[PDB]
Design a protein around this ligand. Structure first.
Ligand code: HEM
Ligand code: HEM
Lengths: 201, 201
């Protein structure tokens, strides 16, 4: 990921907020020399991505985690709202398209987590908290979680470096920016909201 | 990525259809043995992902492509609709959550593409074709593309292997399945559509 200065986060908390809002992540490691990726729910422990700790899990039957034993470096990609920007939206005569998006990339050493129960229970808590209503695991469901643990592998990543991209057209002039934000208002409310938040100072 | 039998693609054209429908991809390779990823528009040349060729571009100022000159293996991830499955929807008591999603992972050897102009023009054509009205570059815009060319690097991936995941709850019995599909119908119609297509024969 390369992040041009004008697409950097306006405030550092924006990276953590993107991570928390988009927990279904891509966990990537270099099995041999080839990249291999698993889609998995990953949560953040700590106030900031940099220096924070990521917690995730996958199927034990997914052999990806077996490469994690050597504690190699992994990349976790969190992707927020995104959308194609067609030059039709600009209404200007020389133009080229782009794609607007926001993403956080976290890199660090992965470690298998012995407390797989705690990881999945924390993941439930995080993902359900903003739903209306939030699902509260019953005692029966918590005993179920315990019974399921042989089939799951949890892992932790201590974040050594992170980058965040907020590519949200903030380099356009006022009229063209207004057209882009307006065009995303109906079809892509999530992207328009991120657009609004990127200009809040 | 590991693909349980229940979540394998039903028909082989479904992988290529996902790729063509979701061109904003994640291009992943090793840089000093650690994974690095760039978000970029990537198009498919060919009827099938496996054995097909992917074409994409990225900023020249993005250093990711400098690791391609050795022609290492890359992974390109195409992501379709996805959504969290809360146990609230199952309406059963011992339960656990999951996440439903569809994705295609293409692996092969990457090479830098000299005709960067042709790559970006084919990308314009591909992404503007499903839109109405479609944006067709004027001669002025084509001249502008030529002016932009120093800042762009194009690349090709000859796809050696491909995996597709269609994790769409098809393992569920009918009453639990109907509740999952009904709950996505309002909030995530693209995902509901993908579940419908997963049951076709
Ligand atoms: C909190 C929200 C959760 C989400 C979004 C979620 C999602 C997922 C996903 C996407 C996979 C596939 C991973 C892969 O491809 O390797 C998976 C696997 C698995 N998860 Fe979770 N999970 C959640 C909570 C839990 C909990 C609380 C448990 C309790 C032990 C659990 C147990 C398992 C097991 C046993 C597997 C492997 C077998 C299977 O795929 O069902 N998960 N989960
Ligand atoms: C057709 C749809 C297109 C889309 C969705 C698109 C999207 C993008 C994206 C996401 C990037 C950032 C890559 C990175 O982070 O390294 C990029 C870079 C770039 N693209 Fe494209 N592009 C398109 C067409 C074109 C065309 C026709 C040209 C004409 C030469 C062009 C020239 C460039 C240049 C110069 C850069 C680097 C500077 C910049 O980020 O604006 N692109 N494009």
């Amino acid at each position: 990921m390369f992040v041009p200065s004008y697409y950097a986060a306006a405030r550092p908390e924006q990276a953590a907020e993107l991570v928390r809002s988009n927990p279904f992540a891509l966990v990537v490691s270099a099995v041999d020399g080839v990249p291999v990726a698993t889609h998995a729910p990953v949560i953040l422990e700590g106030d900031a991505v940099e220096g924070g700790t990521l917690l995730g899990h996958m199927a034990r039957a997914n052999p990806h985690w077996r490469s994690f034993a050597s504690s190699p470096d992994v990349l976790v990609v969190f992707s927020g709202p995104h959308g194609y920007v067609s030059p039709t939206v600009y209404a200007t005569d020389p133009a080229a398209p782009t794609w607007d998006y926001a993403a956080v990339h976290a890199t660090g050493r992965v470690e298998l987590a012995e407390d797989a129960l705690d990881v999945v229970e924390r993941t439930v808590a995080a993902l359900e908290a903003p739903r209306d209503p939030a699902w509260t695991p019953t005692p029966a469901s918590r005993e179920y979680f315990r019974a399921l643990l042989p089939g799951v592998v949890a892992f932790r990543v201590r974040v050594r470096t992170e980058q965040s991209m907020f590519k949200l057209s903030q380099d356009l002039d006022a009229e063209r920016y207004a057209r882009v934000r307006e065009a995303f208002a109906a079809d892509n409310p999530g992207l328009a909201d991120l657009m609004d938040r990127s200009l809040e100072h």
